[PDB]
mmCIF file of C-alpha atoms and ligand atoms in Angstrom:
data_model
loop_
_atom_site.group_PDB
_atom_site.id
_atom_site.type_symbol
_atom_site.label_atom_id
_atom_site.label_comp_id
_atom_site.label_asym_id
_atom_site.label_seq_id
_atom_site.Cartn_x
_atom_site.Cartn_y
_atom_site.Cartn_z
ATOM 1 C CA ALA A 2 120.041 108.836 114.324
ATOM 2 C CA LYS A 3 116.326 108.427 114.888
ATOM 3 C CA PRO A 4 113.964 107.921 111.894
ATOM 4 C CA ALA A 5 111.434 110.650 111.376
ATOM 5 C CA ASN A 6 108.740 111.735 109.027
ATOM 6 C CA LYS A 7 109.145 115.338 107.970
ATOM 7 C CA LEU A 8 105.632 116.542 107.495
ATOM 8 C CA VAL A 9 105.376 119.749 105.438
ATOM 9 C CA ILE A 10 102.220 121.863 105.294
ATOM 10 C CA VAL A 11 102.103 124.796 102.888
ATOM 11 C CA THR A 12 98.955 126.797 102.980
ATOM 12 C CA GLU A 13 97.434 130.244 103.085
ATOM 13 C CA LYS A 14 98.973 132.375 105.728
ATOM 14 C CA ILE A 15 95.729 133.106 107.596
ATOM 15 C CA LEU A 16 95.515 129.478 108.886
ATOM 16 C CA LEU A 17 98.708 129.863 110.973
ATOM 17 C CA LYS A 18 97.073 129.831 114.384
ATOM 18 C CA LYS A 19 94.543 127.123 113.585
ATOM 19 C CA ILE A 20 97.200 124.811 112.229
ATOM 20 C CA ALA A 21 99.618 125.493 115.096
ATOM 21 C CA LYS A 22 96.900 124.457 117.557
ATOM 22 C CA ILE A 23 96.279 121.233 115.574
ATOM 23 C CA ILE A 24 99.988 120.483 115.751
ATOM 24 C CA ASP A 25 100.104 121.212 119.457
ATOM 25 C CA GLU A 26 97.075 118.958 120.001
ATOM 26 C CA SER A 27 98.650 116.075 118.071
ATOM 27 C CA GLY A 28 101.495 115.100 120.414
ATOM 28 C CA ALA A 29 104.170 116.412 118.009
ATOM 29 C CA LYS A 30 107.130 117.645 119.923
ATOM 30 C CA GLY A 31 107.470 120.865 118.014
ATOM 31 C CA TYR A 32 107.368 122.565 114.682
ATOM 32 C CA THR A 33 109.113 125.047 112.442
ATOM 33 C CA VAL A 34 107.189 127.696 110.586
ATOM 34 C CA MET A 35 108.097 130.169 107.872
ATOM 35 C CA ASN A 36 106.720 132.822 105.592
ATOM 36 C CA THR A 37 106.759 131.968 101.893
ATOM 37 C CA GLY A 38 105.371 133.136 98.593
ATOM 38 C CA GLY A 39 103.150 130.687 96.770
ATOM 39 C CA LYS A 40 101.636 130.375 93.303
ATOM 40 C CA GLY A 41 98.909 127.756 92.741
ATOM 41 C CA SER A 54 102.088 139.280 90.258
ATOM 42 C CA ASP A 55 100.173 135.995 91.025
ATOM 43 C CA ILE A 56 102.210 135.175 94.056
ATOM 44 C CA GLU A 57 100.411 135.176 97.413
ATOM 45 C CA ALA A 58 101.515 135.015 101.057
ATOM 46 C CA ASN A 59 101.731 131.529 102.367
ATOM 47 C CA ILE A 60 103.030 129.785 105.399
ATOM 48 C CA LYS A 61 105.009 126.609 105.518
ATOM 49 C CA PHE A 62 105.134 124.356 108.577
ATOM 50 C CA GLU A 63 107.639 121.573 108.962
ATOM 51 C CA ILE A 64 106.903 119.008 111.677
ATOM 52 C CA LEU A 65 109.192 116.066 112.384
ATOM 53 C CA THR A 66 107.220 113.145 113.808
ATOM 54 C CA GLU A 67 108.402 109.815 115.212
ATOM 55 C CA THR A 68 105.579 107.875 113.512
ATOM 56 C CA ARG A 69 103.901 107.951 110.111
ATOM 57 C CA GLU A 70 100.581 107.744 111.944
ATOM 58 C CA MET A 71 101.089 111.003 113.864
ATOM 59 C CA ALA A 72 102.027 112.762 110.614
ATOM 60 C CA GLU A 73 98.898 111.412 108.966
ATOM 61 C CA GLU A 74 96.700 112.459 111.893
ATOM 62 C CA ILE A 75 97.924 116.040 111.586
ATOM 63 C CA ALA A 76 97.588 116.031 107.739
ATOM 64 C CA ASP A 77 94.123 114.533 107.921
ATOM 65 C CA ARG A 78 92.944 116.966 110.504
ATOM 66 C CA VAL A 79 94.196 120.093 108.705
ATOM 67 C CA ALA A 80 92.875 118.916 105.383
ATOM 68 C CA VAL A 81 89.405 117.853 106.584
ATOM 69 C CA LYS A 82 88.906 121.184 108.338
ATOM 70 C CA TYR A 83 90.495 123.629 105.909
ATOM 71 C CA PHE A 84 91.339 122.284 102.469
ATOM 72 C CA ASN A 85 87.883 122.735 101.046
ATOM 73 C CA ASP A 86 88.148 126.472 101.620
ATOM 74 C CA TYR A 87 91.880 127.213 101.457
ATOM 75 C CA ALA A 88 94.636 126.362 99.118
ATOM 76 C CA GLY A 89 97.280 124.019 100.455
ATOM 77 C CA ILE A 90 99.512 121.059 100.025
ATOM 78 C CA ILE A 91 100.758 118.511 102.500
ATOM 79 C CA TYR A 92 103.597 116.120 101.928
ATOM 80 C CA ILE A 93 106.106 114.028 103.746
ATOM 81 C CA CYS A 94 109.827 113.425 103.340
ATOM 82 C CA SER A 95 111.922 110.898 105.133
ATOM 83 C CA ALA A 96 114.389 112.269 107.577
ATOM 84 C CA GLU A 97 116.663 111.116 110.319
ATOM 85 C CA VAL A 98 117.123 113.234 113.470
ATOM 86 C CA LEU A 99 120.709 113.448 114.693
ATOM 87 C CA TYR A 100 120.217 115.819 117.641
ATOM 88 C CA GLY A 101 117.037 116.985 119.248
ATOM 89 C CA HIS A 102 116.424 117.790 122.904
ATOM 90 C CA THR A 103 112.789 116.700 122.953
ATOM 91 C CA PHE A 104 112.481 114.545 119.818
ATOM 92 C CA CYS A 105 114.923 111.836 120.775
ATOM 93 C CA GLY A 106 114.609 111.844 124.584
ATOM 94 C CA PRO A 107 117.212 112.192 127.369
ATOM 95 C CA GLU A 108 119.374 109.395 125.917
ATOM 96 C CA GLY A 109 119.715 111.243 122.587
ATOM 97 C CA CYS A 110 119.215 110.047 119.059
ATOM 98 C CA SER A 111 121.977 107.392 119.011
ATOM 99 C CA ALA A 112 120.932 105.170 121.908
ATOM 100 C CA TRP A 113 122.282 101.567 122.003
ATOM 101 C CA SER A 114 120.649 98.383 123.381
ATOM 102 C CA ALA B 2 99.820 109.229 99.039
ATOM 103 C CA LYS B 3 101.081 110.186 95.633
ATOM 104 C CA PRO B 4 104.846 109.881 94.895
ATOM 105 C CA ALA B 5 106.417 113.191 94.012
ATOM 106 C CA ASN B 6 109.736 114.805 93.472
ATOM 107 C CA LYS B 7 110.367 117.955 95.461
ATOM 108 C CA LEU B 8 112.511 120.080 93.184
ATOM 109 C CA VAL B 9 114.483 122.770 94.915
ATOM 110 C CA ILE B 10 116.215 125.655 93.115
ATOM 111 C CA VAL B 11 118.366 128.044 95.121
ATOM 112 C CA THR B 12 119.680 130.980 93.147
ATOM 113 C CA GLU B 13 120.157 134.671 92.907
ATOM 114 C CA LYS B 14 117.174 136.776 93.884
ATOM 115 C CA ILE B 15 117.133 138.736 90.616
ATOM 116 C CA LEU B 16 116.168 135.565 88.764
ATOM 117 C CA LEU B 17 112.800 135.214 90.547
ATOM 118 C CA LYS B 18 110.535 136.274 87.668
ATOM 119 C CA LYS B 19 112.625 134.520 85.041
ATOM 120 C CA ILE B 20 112.544 131.226 86.858
ATOM 121 C CA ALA B 21 108.859 131.518 87.799
ATOM 122 C CA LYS B 22 108.156 131.882 84.083
ATOM 123 C CA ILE B 23 109.940 128.607 83.384
ATOM 124 C CA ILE B 24 108.074 126.814 86.145
ATOM 125 C CA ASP B 25 104.806 128.241 84.802
ATOM 126 C CA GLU B 26 105.468 126.945 81.246
ATOM 127 C CA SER B 27 106.578 123.499 82.519
ATOM 128 C CA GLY B 28 103.174 122.260 83.423
ATOM 129 C CA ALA B 29 104.081 122.280 87.137
ATOM 130 C CA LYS B 30 100.939 122.928 89.163
ATOM 131 C CA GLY B 31 102.411 125.552 91.481
ATOM 132 C CA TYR B 32 105.468 126.492 93.409
ATOM 133 C CA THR B 33 106.642 128.060 96.601
ATOM 134 C CA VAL B 34 109.399 130.693 96.745
ATOM 135 C CA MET B 35 111.099 132.424 99.588
ATOM 136 C CA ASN B 36 113.847 134.864 100.299
ATOM 137 C CA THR B 37 116.966 133.209 101.797
ATOM 138 C CA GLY B 38 120.599 133.920 102.588
ATOM 139 C CA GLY B 39 123.418 131.745 101.296
ATOM 140 C CA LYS B 40 127.094 131.175 100.754
ATOM 141 C CA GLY B 41 128.411 129.099 97.822
ATOM 142 C CA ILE B 56 125.942 135.815 103.017
ATOM 143 C CA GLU B 57 124.317 136.632 99.637
ATOM 144 C CA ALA B 58 120.586 137.426 98.900
ATOM 145 C CA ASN B 59 119.113 134.378 97.451
ATOM 146 C CA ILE B 60 115.793 132.877 96.708
ATOM 147 C CA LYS B 61 114.704 129.276 97.105
ATOM 148 C CA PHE B 62 111.957 127.761 94.962
ATOM 149 C CA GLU B 63 110.208 124.466 95.872
ATOM 150 C CA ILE B 64 108.217 122.709 93.176
ATOM 151 C CA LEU B 65 106.460 119.320 93.654
ATOM 152 C CA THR B 66 106.284 117.368 90.438
ATOM 153 C CA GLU B 67 104.358 114.199 89.617
ATOM 154 C CA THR B 68 107.187 112.781 87.540
ATOM 155 C CA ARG B 69 110.976 112.806 87.742
ATOM 156 C CA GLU B 70 110.983 113.827 84.001
ATOM 157 C CA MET B 71 109.099 117.081 84.733
ATOM 158 C CA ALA B 72 111.520 117.910 87.561
ATOM 159 C CA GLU B 73 114.505 117.178 85.352
ATOM 160 C CA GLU B 74 113.130 119.211 82.395
ATOM 161 C CA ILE B 75 112.562 122.240 84.683
ATOM 162 C CA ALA B 76 116.060 121.762 86.152
ATOM 163 C CA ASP B 77 117.594 121.424 82.667
ATOM 164 C CA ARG B 78 115.847 124.532 81.349
ATOM 165 C CA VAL B 79 116.821 126.699 84.356
ATOM 166 C CA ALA B 80 120.376 125.474 84.560
ATOM 167 C CA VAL B 81 121.135 125.836 80.840
ATOM 168 C CA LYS B 82 119.493 129.209 80.576
ATOM 169 C CA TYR B 83 120.999 130.777 83.714
ATOM 170 C CA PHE B 84 123.466 128.677 85.713
ATOM 171 C CA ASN B 85 126.513 129.281 83.557
ATOM 172 C CA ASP B 86 125.962 133.044 84.189
ATOM 173 C CA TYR B 87 124.417 133.192 87.674
ATOM 174 C CA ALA B 88 124.940 131.273 90.901
ATOM 175 C CA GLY B 89 122.556 128.377 91.450
ATOM 176 C CA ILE B 90 122.020 124.910 92.814
ATOM 177 C CA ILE B 91 119.228 122.470 91.914
ATOM 178 C CA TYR B 92 118.343 119.370 93.855
ATOM 179 C CA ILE B 93 115.539 116.921 94.446
ATOM 180 C CA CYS B 94 114.109 115.097 97.458
ATOM 181 C CA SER B 95 111.678 112.201 97.281
ATOM 182 C CA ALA B 96 108.307 113.121 98.709
ATOM 183 C CA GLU B 97 104.866 111.704 99.172
ATOM 184 C CA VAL B 98 101.933 114.094 98.734
ATOM 185 C CA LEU B 99 99.101 113.411 101.168
ATOM 186 C CA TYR B 100 96.860 116.300 100.165
ATOM 187 C CA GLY B 101 96.958 118.734 97.286
ATOM 188 C CA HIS B 102 93.865 119.737 95.365
ATOM 189 C CA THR B 103 95.694 120.671 92.158
ATOM 190 C CA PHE B 104 98.674 118.341 92.471
ATOM 191 C CA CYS B 105 96.731 115.154 92.882
ATOM 192 C CA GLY B 106 93.668 116.269 90.876
ATOM 193 C CA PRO B 107 90.099 114.865 91.255
ATOM 194 C CA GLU B 108 91.317 111.236 91.728
ATOM 195 C CA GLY B 109 92.923 112.466 94.977
ATOM 196 C CA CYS B 110 96.338 111.617 96.330
ATOM 197 C CA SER B 111 95.722 107.834 95.813
ATOM 198 C CA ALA B 112 94.677 107.586 99.479
ATOM 199 C CA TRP B 113 94.746 103.745 99.482
ATOM 200 C CA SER B 114 97.732 103.130 97.187
ATOM 201 C CA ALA C 2 122.276 113.307 89.382
ATOM 202 C CA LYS C 3 124.678 113.093 92.305
ATOM 203 C CA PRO C 4 123.523 111.659 95.628
ATOM 204 C CA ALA C 5 123.756 114.081 98.501
ATOM 205 C CA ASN C 6 122.896 114.548 102.145
ATOM 206 C CA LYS C 7 120.792 117.539 103.160
ATOM 207 C CA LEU C 8 121.711 118.475 106.695
ATOM 208 C CA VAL C 9 119.249 120.819 108.407
ATOM 209 C CA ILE C 10 120.028 122.741 111.559
ATOM 210 C CA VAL C 11 117.332 124.699 113.286
ATOM 211 C CA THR C 12 118.605 126.757 116.184
ATOM 212 C CA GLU C 13 118.679 130.186 117.837
ATOM 213 C CA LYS C 14 119.190 133.344 115.790
ATOM 214 C CA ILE C 15 122.241 134.484 117.851
ATOM 215 C CA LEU C 16 124.276 131.439 116.696
ATOM 216 C CA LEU C 17 124.076 132.435 113.008
ATOM 217 C CA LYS C 18 127.732 133.417 112.471
ATOM 218 C CA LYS C 19 129.036 130.745 114.796
ATOM 219 C CA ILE C 20 127.327 127.954 112.991
ATOM 220 C CA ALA C 21 128.225 129.446 109.570
ATOM 221 C CA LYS C 22 131.901 129.347 110.622
ATOM 222 C CA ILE C 23 131.570 125.673 111.637
ATOM 223 C CA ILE C 24 129.927 124.794 108.280
ATOM 224 C CA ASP C 25 132.769 126.455 106.383
ATOM 225 C CA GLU C 26 135.468 124.799 108.537
ATOM 226 C CA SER C 27 133.920 121.374 107.662
ATOM 227 C CA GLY C 28 134.698 121.548 103.935
ATOM 228 C CA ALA C 29 131.057 121.923 102.934
ATOM 229 C CA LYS C 30 130.785 123.874 99.678
ATOM 230 C CA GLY C 31 127.881 126.077 100.648
ATOM 231 C CA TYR C 32 124.779 126.503 102.693
ATOM 232 C CA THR C 33 121.450 128.253 102.685
ATOM 233 C CA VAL C 34 120.056 129.991 105.750
ATOM 234 C CA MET C 35 116.653 131.485 106.480
ATOM 235 C CA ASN C 36 114.683 133.152 109.177
ATOM 236 C CA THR C 37 112.099 130.885 110.710
ATOM 237 C CA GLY C 38 109.767 130.625 113.651
ATOM 238 C CA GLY C 39 109.466 127.578 115.868
ATOM 239 C CA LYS C 40 107.894 126.010 118.921
ATOM 240 C CA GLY C 41 109.796 123.093 120.602
ATOM 241 C CA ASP C 55 104.433 130.704 121.670
ATOM 242 C CA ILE C 56 106.370 130.824 118.341
ATOM 243 C CA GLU C 57 109.891 132.281 118.639
ATOM 244 C CA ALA C 58 112.286 133.608 116.046
ATOM 245 C CA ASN C 59 114.954 131.262 114.902
ATOM 246 C CA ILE C 60 117.073 130.281 111.952
ATOM 247 C CA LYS C 61 117.345 127.284 109.712
ATOM 248 C CA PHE C 62 120.452 126.204 107.836
ATOM 249 C CA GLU C 63 120.401 123.737 104.970
ATOM 250 C CA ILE C 64 123.735 122.257 103.943
ATOM 251 C CA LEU C 65 124.129 119.807 101.100
ATOM 252 C CA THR C 66 127.118 117.479 101.646
ATOM 253 C CA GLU C 67 128.678 114.925 99.333
ATOM 254 C CA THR C 68 129.277 112.513 102.180
ATOM 255 C CA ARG C 69 127.309 111.447 105.206
ATOM 256 C CA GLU C 70 130.353 111.791 107.505
ATOM 257 C CA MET C 71 130.768 115.501 106.542
ATOM 258 C CA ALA C 72 127.121 116.117 107.492
ATOM 259 C CA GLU C 73 127.542 114.318 110.816
ATOM 260 C CA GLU C 74 130.841 116.126 111.532
ATOM 261 C CA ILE C 75 129.041 119.476 111.188
ATOM 262 C CA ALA C 76 126.149 118.112 113.237
ATOM 263 C CA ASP C 77 128.408 116.807 116.007
ATOM 264 C CA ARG C 78 130.452 120.007 116.280
ATOM 265 C CA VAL C 79 127.352 122.221 116.498
ATOM 266 C CA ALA C 80 125.577 120.063 119.086
ATOM 267 C CA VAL C 81 128.532 119.489 121.370
ATOM 268 C CA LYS C 82 129.489 123.185 121.267
ATOM 269 C CA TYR C 83 125.940 124.564 121.642
ATOM 270 C CA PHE C 84 122.972 122.233 122.323
ATOM 271 C CA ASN C 85 123.432 122.080 126.055
ATOM 272 C CA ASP C 86 122.757 125.809 126.200
ATOM 273 C CA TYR C 87 120.700 126.692 123.122
ATOM 274 C CA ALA C 88 117.475 125.401 121.560
ATOM 275 C CA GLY C 89 117.873 123.344 118.385
ATOM 276 C CA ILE C 90 117.251 120.298 116.206
ATOM 277 C CA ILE C 91 119.503 118.709 113.524
ATOM 278 C CA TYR C 92 118.278 116.243 110.979
ATOM 279 C CA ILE C 93 119.162 114.905 107.559
ATOM 280 C CA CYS C 94 117.212 114.127 104.422
ATOM 281 C CA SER C 95 118.406 112.260 101.363
ATOM 282 C CA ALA C 96 118.705 114.406 98.250
ATOM 283 C CA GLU C 97 120.134 114.327 94.789
ATOM 284 C CA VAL C 98 121.862 117.307 93.233
ATOM 285 C CA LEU C 99 120.974 117.827 89.614
ATOM 286 C CA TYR C 100 122.979 121.022 88.961
ATOM 287 C CA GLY C 101 125.673 122.732 90.984
ATOM 288 C CA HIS C 102 128.954 124.346 89.985
ATOM 289 C CA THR C 103 130.929 123.435 93.046
ATOM 290 C CA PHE C 104 129.014 120.478 94.372
ATOM 291 C CA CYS C 105 129.456 118.310 91.313
ATOM 292 C CA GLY C 106 132.659 119.818 89.911
ATOM 293 C CA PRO C 107 133.461 120.725 86.217
ATOM 294 C CA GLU C 108 131.963 117.609 84.586
ATOM 295 C CA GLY C 109 128.533 118.305 86.173
ATOM 296 C CA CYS C 110 126.301 116.080 88.279
HETATM 297 N N1 AMP D 201 102.585 121.149 92.795
HETATM 298 C C1 AMP D 201 102.867 121.979 93.831
HETATM 299 N N2 AMP D 201 104.145 122.224 94.267
HETATM 300 C C2 AMP D 201 104.422 123.049 95.305
HETATM 301 N N3 AMP D 201 103.465 123.722 95.971
HETATM 302 C C3 AMP D 201 102.151 123.568 95.618
HETATM 303 C C4 AMP D 201 101.758 122.679 94.507
HETATM 304 N N4 AMP D 201 100.409 122.734 94.378
HETATM 305 C C5 AMP D 201 99.974 123.593 95.344
HETATM 306 N N5 AMP D 201 101.009 124.087 96.077
HETATM 307 C C6 AMP D 201 100.977 125.048 97.223
HETATM 308 O O1 AMP D 201 99.731 124.997 97.924
HETATM 309 C C7 AMP D 201 98.833 125.914 97.325
HETATM 310 C C8 AMP D 201 97.999 125.176 96.271
HETATM 311 O O2 AMP D 201 96.857 124.597 96.907
HETATM 312 P P1 AMP D 201 95.874 123.558 96.162
HETATM 313 O O3 AMP D 201 95.596 124.249 94.849
HETATM 314 O O4 AMP D 201 94.699 123.531 97.090
HETATM 315 O O5 AMP D 201 96.750 122.317 96.075
HETATM 316 C C9 AMP D 201 99.721 127.022 96.767
HETATM 317 O O6 AMP D 201 99.693 128.166 97.629
HETATM 318 C C10 AMP D 201 101.129 126.462 96.708
HETATM 319 O O7 AMP D 201 102.016 127.200 97.550
HETATM 320 N N1 AMP D 202 126.465 122.675 99.317
HETATM 321 C C1 AMP D 202 125.401 123.508 99.433
HETATM 322 N N2 AMP D 202 124.424 123.343 100.340
HETATM 323 C C2 AMP D 202 123.312 124.144 100.435
HETATM 324 N N3 AMP D 202 123.144 125.224 99.648
HETATM 325 C C3 AMP D 202 124.072 125.519 98.711
HETATM 326 C C4 AMP D 202 125.270 124.677 98.528
HETATM 327 N N4 AMP D 202 125.998 125.219 97.530
HETATM 328 C C5 AMP D 202 125.323 126.314 97.088
HETATM 329 N N5 AMP D 202 124.186 126.488 97.804
HETATM 330 C C6 AMP D 202 123.186 127.580 97.654
HETATM 331 O O1 AMP D 202 123.060 128.033 96.292
HETATM 332 C C7 AMP D 202 123.555 129.362 96.167
HETATM 333 C C8 AMP D 202 124.362 129.466 94.899
HETATM 334 O O2 AMP D 202 125.477 128.578 94.992
HETATM 335 P P1 AMP D 202 126.838 128.739 94.149
HETATM 336 O O3 AMP D 202 126.373 128.630 92.703
HETATM 337 O O4 AMP D 202 127.781 127.633 94.585
HETATM 338 O O5 AMP D 202 127.388 130.097 94.560
HETATM 339 C C9 AMP D 202 124.339 129.634 97.454
HETATM 340 O O6 AMP D 202 124.409 131.035 97.731
HETATM 341 C C10 AMP D 202 123.647 128.778 98.499
HETATM 342 O O7 AMP D 202 122.494 129.367 99.171
HETATM 343 N N1 AMP D 203 109.569 117.873 115.962
HETATM 344 C C1 AMP D 203 110.019 119.002 115.361
HETATM 345 N N2 AMP D 203 109.776 119.295 114.059
HETATM 346 C C2 AMP D 203 110.208 120.423 113.434
HETATM 347 N N3 AMP D 203 110.919 121.370 114.074
HETATM 348 C C3 AMP D 203 111.221 121.193 115.391
HETATM 349 C C4 AMP D 203 110.785 119.988 116.136
HETATM 350 N N4 AMP D 203 111.218 120.109 117.415
HETATM 351 C C5 AMP D 203 111.903 121.297 117.487
HETATM 352 N N5 AMP D 203 111.891 121.923 116.280
HETATM 353 C C6 AMP D 203 112.515 123.202 115.883
HETATM 354 O O1 AMP D 203 113.729 123.426 116.642
HETATM 355 C C7 AMP D 203 113.530 124.604 117.441
HETATM 356 C C8 AMP D 203 114.145 124.406 118.819
HETATM 357 O O2 AMP D 203 113.616 123.217 119.405
HETATM 358 P P1 AMP D 203 113.822 122.768 120.965
HETATM 359 O O3 AMP D 203 115.299 122.998 121.187
HETATM 360 O O4 AMP D 203 113.481 121.277 121.036
HETATM 361 O O5 AMP D 203 112.878 123.702 121.709
HETATM 362 C C9 AMP D 203 112.013 124.818 117.501
HETATM 363 O O6 AMP D 203 111.631 126.170 117.775
HETATM 364 C C10 AMP D 203 111.564 124.349 116.133
HETATM 365 O O7 AMP D 203 111.767 125.341 115.113
#
């Protein structure tokens, strides 16, 4: 297994394209996105991104960039969870996530 | 970053309003909720609530489980999380950027 | 609270039933599944979340999925630590 930061961005659904381009520009190998309801009926349409990154620094770069650009004007939260990747074509590399020395 | 518990509640879809009410009264600052499928394929909902303290997450869990989970299907779990940004969650003092 | 492993499988929509069958055959007590988008242009996929009591049960599911499918289909499998606070089946009759 390969350690990973699971970066989660939940924000207003209109920022989808802007945030995807920030993720693409970061070096992250990919991302998962989904529609969600958020309260912060009072529920509104949100989007949640989940981005597994190899380093804490890459996660922080993405978080920082989204927040500095958008979080004055739009509701959102960004957090990280620890994760381990077991299988992942691009995340772990050709030798997979359980490489030996 | 500010330590948080990510409280997850997966349950029957018909409980959405009832559980949102509990989360609202808890002092939690917000929540996410989404339609999901599940087997325990049924129509489910999943709530995600970040809480500042483990006690808040446990009180919400306790309230929901006692009120509904002997009569309806449901699972409640927590993940550790660190909040980097969150205007309401971290408040004015920010997400302790240098802690 | 009862420690748990949260196994997450993101993969192609067509494998929904096939992966569900593998999760069940593993002894896992349940799973959640949802429609997602991903890049890895955004395309439609699915995400499974499976809480397991043991790490080996999570890796058994993971191994069986990846060997059977990840040469031919897009996907990622990862695990997060979790604790279950309430669950009928996960914790048994005496609760978590
Ligand atoms: N404590 C929280 N737990 C979960 N989601 C939250 C929380 N606070 C805010 N959010 C999410 O992010 C938005 C709130 O943004 P903000 O008020 O700028 O933190 C809402 O749409 C929620 O979906
Ligand atoms: N072991 C598990 N892993 C992930 N989700 C679960 C698990 N057990 C139950 N669930 C979810 O919670 C719902 C209610 O569970 P249950 O009360 O066991 O029928 C299910 O329909 C699933 O979506
Ligand atoms: N680093 C990552 N973080 C989050 N999700 C990912 C990542 N890499 C891949 N995925 C998800 O897994 C799916 C298939 O990935 P791939 O097989 O690598 O193209 C993508 O469409 C994403 O939903």
